[PDB]
Amino acid sequence: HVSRNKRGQVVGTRGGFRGCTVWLTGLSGAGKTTVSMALEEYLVCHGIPCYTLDGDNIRQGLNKNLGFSPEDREENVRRIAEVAKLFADAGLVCITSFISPYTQDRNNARQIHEGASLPFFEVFVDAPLHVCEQRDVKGLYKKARAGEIKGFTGIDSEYEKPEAPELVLKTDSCDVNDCVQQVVELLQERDIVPVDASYEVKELYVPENKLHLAKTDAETLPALKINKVDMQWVQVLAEGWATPLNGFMREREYLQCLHFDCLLDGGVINLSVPIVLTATHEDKERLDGCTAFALMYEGRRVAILRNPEFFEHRKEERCARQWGTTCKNHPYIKMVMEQGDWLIGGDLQVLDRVYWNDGLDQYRLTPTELKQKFKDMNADAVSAFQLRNPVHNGHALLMQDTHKQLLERGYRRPVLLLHPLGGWTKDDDVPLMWRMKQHAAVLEEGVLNPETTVVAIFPSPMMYAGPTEVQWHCRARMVAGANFYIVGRDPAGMPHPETGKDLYEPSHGAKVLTMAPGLITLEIVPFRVAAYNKKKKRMDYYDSEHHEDFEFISGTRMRKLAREGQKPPEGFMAPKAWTVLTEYYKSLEK
Amino acid sequence: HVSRNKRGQVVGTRGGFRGCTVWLTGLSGAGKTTVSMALEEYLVCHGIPCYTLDGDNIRQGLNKNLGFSPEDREENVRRIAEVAKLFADAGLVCITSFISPYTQDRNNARQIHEGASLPFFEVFVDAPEYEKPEAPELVLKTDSCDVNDCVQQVVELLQERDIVPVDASYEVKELYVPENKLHLAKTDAETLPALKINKVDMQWVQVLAEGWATPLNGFMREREYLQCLHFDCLLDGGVINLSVPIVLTATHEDKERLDGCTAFALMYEGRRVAILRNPEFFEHRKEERCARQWGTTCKNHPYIKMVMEQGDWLIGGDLQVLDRVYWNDGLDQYRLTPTELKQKFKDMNADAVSAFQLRNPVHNGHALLMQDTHKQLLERGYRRPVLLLHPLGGWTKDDDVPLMWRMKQHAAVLEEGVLNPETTVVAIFPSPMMYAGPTEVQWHCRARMVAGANFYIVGRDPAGMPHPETGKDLYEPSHGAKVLTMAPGLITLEIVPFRVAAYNKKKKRMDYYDSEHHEDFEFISGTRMRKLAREGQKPPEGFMAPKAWTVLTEYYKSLEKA
Numbered sequence A: 001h002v003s004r005n006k007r008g009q010v011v012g013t014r015g016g017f018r019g020c021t022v023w024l025t026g027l028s029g030a031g032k033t034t035v036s037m038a039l040e041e042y043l044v045c046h047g048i049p050c051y052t053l054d055g056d057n058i059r060q061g062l063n064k065n066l067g068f069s070p071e072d073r074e075e076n077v078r079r080i081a082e083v084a085k086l087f088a089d090a091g092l093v094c095i096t097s098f099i100s101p102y103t104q105d106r107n108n109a110r111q112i113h114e115g116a117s118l119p120f121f122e123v124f125v126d127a128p129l130h131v132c133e134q135r136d137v138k139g140l141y142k143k144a145r146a147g148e149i150k151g152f153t154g155i156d157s158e159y160e161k162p163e164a165p166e167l168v169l170k171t172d173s174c175d176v177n178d179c180v181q182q183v184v185e186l187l188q189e190r191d192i193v194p195v196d197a198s199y200e201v202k203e204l205y206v207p208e209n210k211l212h213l214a215k216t217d218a219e220t221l222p223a224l225k226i227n228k229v230d231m232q233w234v235q236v237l238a239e240g241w242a243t244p245l246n247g248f249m250r251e252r253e254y255l256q257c258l259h260f261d262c263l264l265d266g267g268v269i270n271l272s273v274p275i276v277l278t279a280t281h282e283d284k285e286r287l288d289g290c291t292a293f294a295l296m297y298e299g300r301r302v303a304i305l306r307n308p309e310f311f312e313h314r315k316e317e318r319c320a321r322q323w324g325t326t327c328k329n330h331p332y333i334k335m336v337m338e339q340g341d342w343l344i345g346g347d348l349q350v351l352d353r354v355y356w357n358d359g360l361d362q363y364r365l366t367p368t369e370l371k372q373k374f375k376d377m378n379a380d381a382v383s384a385f386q387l388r389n390p391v392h393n394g395h396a397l398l399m400q401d402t403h404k405q406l407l408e409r410g411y412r413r414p415v416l417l418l419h420p421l422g423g424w425t426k427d428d429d430v431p432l433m434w435r436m437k438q439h440a441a442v443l444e445e446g447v448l449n450p451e452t453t454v455v456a457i458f459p460s461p462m463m464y465a466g467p468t469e470v471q472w473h474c475r476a477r478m479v480a481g482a483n484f485y486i487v488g489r490d491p492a493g494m495p496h497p498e499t500g501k502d503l504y505e506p507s508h509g510a511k512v513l514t515m516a517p518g519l520i521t522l523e524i525v526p527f528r529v530a531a532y533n534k535k536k537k538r539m540d541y542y543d544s545e546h547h548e549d550f551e552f553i554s555g556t557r558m559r560k561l562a563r564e565g566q567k568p569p570e571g572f573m574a575p576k577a578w579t580v581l582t583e584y585y586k587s588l589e590k
Numbered sequence B: 001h002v003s004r005n006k007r008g009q010v011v012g013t014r015g016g017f018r019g020c021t022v023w024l025t026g027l028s029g030a031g032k033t034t035v036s037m038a039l040e041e042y043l044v045c046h047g048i049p050c051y052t053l054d055g056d057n058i059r060q061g062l063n064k065n066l067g068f069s070p071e072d073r074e075e076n077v078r079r080i081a082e083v084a085k086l087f088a089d090a091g092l093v094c095i096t097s098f099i100s101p102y103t104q105d106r107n108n109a110r111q112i113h114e115g116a117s118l119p120f121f122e123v124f125v126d127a128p129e130y131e132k133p134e135a136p137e138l139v140l141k142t143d144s145c146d147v148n149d150c151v152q153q154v155v156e157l158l159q160e161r162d163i164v165p166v167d168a169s170y171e172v173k174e175l176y177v178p179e180n181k182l183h184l185a186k187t188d189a190e191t192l193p194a195l196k197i198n199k200v201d202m203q204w205v206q207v208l209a210e211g212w213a214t215p216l217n218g219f220m221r222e223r224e225y226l227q228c229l230h231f232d233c234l235l236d237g238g239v240i241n242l243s244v245p246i247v248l249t250a251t252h253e254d255k256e257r258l259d260g261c262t263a264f265a266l267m268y269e270g271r272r273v274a275i276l277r278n279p280e281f282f283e284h285r286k287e288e289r290c291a292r293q294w295g296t297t298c299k300n301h302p303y304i305k306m307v308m309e310q311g312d313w314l315i316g317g318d319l320q321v322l323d324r325v326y327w328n329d330g331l332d333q334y335r336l337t338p339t340e341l342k343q344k345f346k347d348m349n350a351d352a353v354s355a356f357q358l359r360n361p362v363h364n365g366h367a368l369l370m371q372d373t374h375k376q377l378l379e380r381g382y383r384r385p386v387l388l389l390h391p392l393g394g395w396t397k398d399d400d401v402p403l404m405w406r407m408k409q410h411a412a413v414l415e416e417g418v419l420n421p422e423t424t425v426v427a428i429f430p431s432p433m434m435y436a437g438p439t440e441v442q443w444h445c446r447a448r449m450v451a452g453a454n455f456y457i458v459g460r461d462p463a464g465m466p467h468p469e470t471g472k473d474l475y476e477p478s479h480g481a482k483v484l485t486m487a488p489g490l491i492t493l494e495i496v497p498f499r500v501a502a503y504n505k506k507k508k509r510m511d512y513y514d515s516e517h518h519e520d521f522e523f524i525s526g527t528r529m530r531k532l533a534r535e536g537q538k539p540p541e542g543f544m545a546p547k548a549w550t551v552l553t554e555y556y557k558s559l560e561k562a
């Protein structure tokens, strides 16, 4: 005979044996058939073979030779309990839906199963007798108030409530979804139904009431000193932008992320950039062995990494796979090229909440804070715009036209998340303080509407990885509640440092994003290149036959205009926003 | 109530509704118990949910308040037939093992099934008031053939009535034009512009033609190229593993000349060998391609070096391959397509196929992996595991042992019986070798998945090589296996990963290496083998079969004469 654990490998797609019996009981019309039908549908929609035993299939076949003549009812239940045990033994979730009114017959069904090592879940579908008669779903209670039916349970014979059911469904105070969810959650607690990977925000901050204690704990551990870009990835993790990571990636997660751009355990989750912690040979041999250590930034213990695992940082290969180049003068690759040769994964418990105390912490909303803000503005669509640059009206055009399309589709309260990145950025980019001041101005001028625009700062370092990075950009906003993700040309790219051509082809970011796995709850809203049209005196989308109508105004052209004291053409950038830049460009030359 | 067709889709790893009842009847207890156990084993070995009702789970449970009166026995068999119905309706193959002596009773059990549109198979376990069935679907003579032959007869019947798939490997899409359309297609090819291709490109034309890259319809179009480089899979219409670009390159000159055209012919050695239809041209970004496929852009990597010499366009399209690819070098007999391999495995009556990709001479370390896989399968209840020894035959780097010499070596290894020729199919995989480690190992695996392998063996540093700059392992040696074991899109086969095997001095054989015995282990590389041949030494006894080593000294001698 084949073992259960072998039957578990071939019953269904998900591995592991999960045979068991979900035993529904309660009065006629309490809700058993309704629950079973819906529970079955849930299990099947999730790849879990199940079979339902009910009146339709038992009392009309196996049990056609029994009535409700209280011996018959014992024998009913007994035969059902035996069948159920055989389904459960075969590896199915067996759901049984019978009134099953005797406490002794149900316990017997329970012992038939516990005796052969099969889980048994007694679910009391509990509606007051008067409610069940209200529903009289099949016309039986009236057929029995008239006499014409037996000792119908609840009226003429007894129903004995279960004493310690695994779950009581109060079907007069909850809906069917409430029932299904309570049962499914039971089966998840008891390892019959797996908990699939989720994008539900998962912070890695310790709770405030556990915080003091965790700090004291942290103080006893070895420590590892981290730097600022590390502390900003500490923040990305803490706040949940890399949900469902539990900490810095372990080997397995790292390799998934680099080869497939996804995490794969428990379901496909897009996560296309390594979120890792590096260490030197020296730190590894020092910390390896220890079940916990603390991470220290600017002499403060900012987090604890528990159950840590050390694996090699193969850096040329990492770089080549993440960036499509191993060019040493790419500014992030250069940082990676200086780090250690080990990476460290583990479970990260972050302590004090991360504040940078620079005048900008009011913008640094967590994904929870952001979803609250949308809820409070009552948005019915959130479009997100990642940017790392001053907003010119070419960007504003992508934002305005996405806003138009949402309206045209029926949304009535579209909100724009204007989402500049504020983590590490390469040397020649405009500093965050300045870009925030510049977008404030675009908004003060009404190029974008302040009453429908949330402005906040995305804490991730920037990688400048093009079509790899953009997925990361997008998935982060997805976690924070965005339903539409605006993407133009060359997102996340830059010039190749050696050749000066674009590192990445300009349509790939979008093409890749639109077909990347894991990006299921948001729609990609992609755009062609916009540039200053000279005829119409505004930004518009570039067209082939009019190469000459269009001026492209580089970041180098702006630095140049500001310095020769001129102005970009009219329609390129909100005048006040422009001024902030001149102000920026002024302190730059020094 | 969820439908059969939907329960069907989730019951097994395989899909299709295949609920039914195999109803054994007859006197012989051992007959029925032996067959039903063995059927059960076979179904489970083959991914089909089943459940056996017999004395041991019915007698003392469901039918325990029944005794031997004629009514009680009638009822005994009624209750079993109803319960079997429930398992068949639930999508399981329900196997019933009771004497069930009377026609009335078996006829009723059938009717419970046929009246709910569930197949019922009355299998008469016949071995000399039992009432023999008048029209059973199978007569099993258990006294006169073995259990495995019986179980085969059942399995055949279940194949015939579409319960057990004839197949269930991934369906192969060949790109060859069917032979009835050839001469025509050859004529049509003659009217079109032509693009001359080289030998490596012709190898990939073969890879495509024969179906190894199923479901591509030809050289990769942009979207597929981007899926393959970013995600290691094709995604459109289902995730399947494909981690290496399968592409045709072109110069600026050739692109200009051909972009515009709706079909052109591929030309190898003056012969038109294919038409590419509805072509699209997209950039060959070499540096990025390289970096993402190989995890390095090292200009001296030998396949990277060829990609860097190719043109800056790629051409995707629908590929129709004309004459069968034959190389006329004395090895064509081993060049089996996925279709011919699947037929070869059927003809051998395999019930498990383990595939071993390789590019090197087989030492007894490799054989050990193969031998261990073959043991693991025996134990899991497979009874005719067949090994596909599948040397790669496409382009390989300059210092590798040539295909012909390897084939003759491999032939020596089977002649010494380190591998059994009777359970072993030797064939040549036609792909070029990329030397891309964990990225390429997925290509190696998927291609064999398409050829119907069920288990795919992988050891240390698969598809790797020394980094040409440092001589250090270009790849981390455990990665291939770690990546492969978790890679998406390879759901119809099992990966069997192995730790590194090396020569044990103390045991005088190849065994798995152990940290705390470092010293007993001798690692003999290709370099060391060539050094040893050149001084007239043999490697230790147990490392390589003698006749196979002698083939190698012949090879190393030929090198020396040059």
Ligand SMILES: Nc1ncnc2c1ncn2[C@@H]1O[C@H](COP(=O)(O)OP(=O)(O)O)[C@@H](O)[C@H]1O
Pocket: A026, A027, A028, A029, A030, A031, A032, A033, A034, A035, A097, A125, A135, A137, A170, A171, A172, A174, A175, A176, A179
């Ligand atoms: N939360 C609930 N769970 C199940 N049924 C509910 C619930 N709330 C209201 N109902 C209604 O009560 C009725 C219960 O009917 P039925 O499932 O067939 O009961 P039973 O199988 O217990 O005889 C249905 O019409 C159902 O829609």
Ligand SMILES: Nc1ncnc2c1ncn2[C@@H]1O[C@H](COP(=O)(O)OS(=O)(=O)O)[C@@H](O)[C@H]1O
Pocket: A028, A055, A059, A068, A072, A073, A074, A076, A077, A097, A098, A099, A100, A101, A140, A149, A150, A151, A152, A153
């Ligand atoms: N005597 C009765 N008491 C309760 N239900 C009855 C009775 N007679 C017929 N029925 C109907 O038979 C159906 C199935 O009852 P069961 O769940 O199988 O009862 S049980 O108590 O023996 O578990 C119910 O919808 C029920 O209304």
Ligand SMILES: Nc1ncnc2c1ncn2[C@@H]1O[C@H](COP(=O)(O)OS(=O)(=O)O)[C@@H](O)[C@H]1O
Pocket: A386, A387, A388, A389, A394, A395, A398, A486, A487, A488, A489, A490, A491, A492, A493, A527, A528, A529, A530, A531
């Ligand atoms: N002028 C352009 N036309 C269309 N889209 C653009 C243009 N410039 C930038 N984008 C898009 O605007 C967004 C942000 O631009 P950037 O801030 O420069 O860099 S990125 O690193 O955030 O993309 C991305 O979607 C990017 O493709």
Ligand SMILES: Nc1ncnc2c1ncn2[C@@H]1O[C@H](COP(=O)(O)OS(=O)(=O)O)[C@@H](O)[C@H]1O
Pocket: B357, B358, B359, B360, B361, B365, B366, B369, B457, B458, B459, B460, B461, B462, B463, B464, B498, B499, B500, B501, B502
């Ligand atoms: N000594 C060894 N021990 C374990 N695995 C090995 C050893 N040598 C090679 N392998 C594995 O054997 C297979 C064939 O290896 P090779 O022919 O050297 O090269 S490969 O390119 O085809 O993988 C691969 O799965 C590889 O990982």
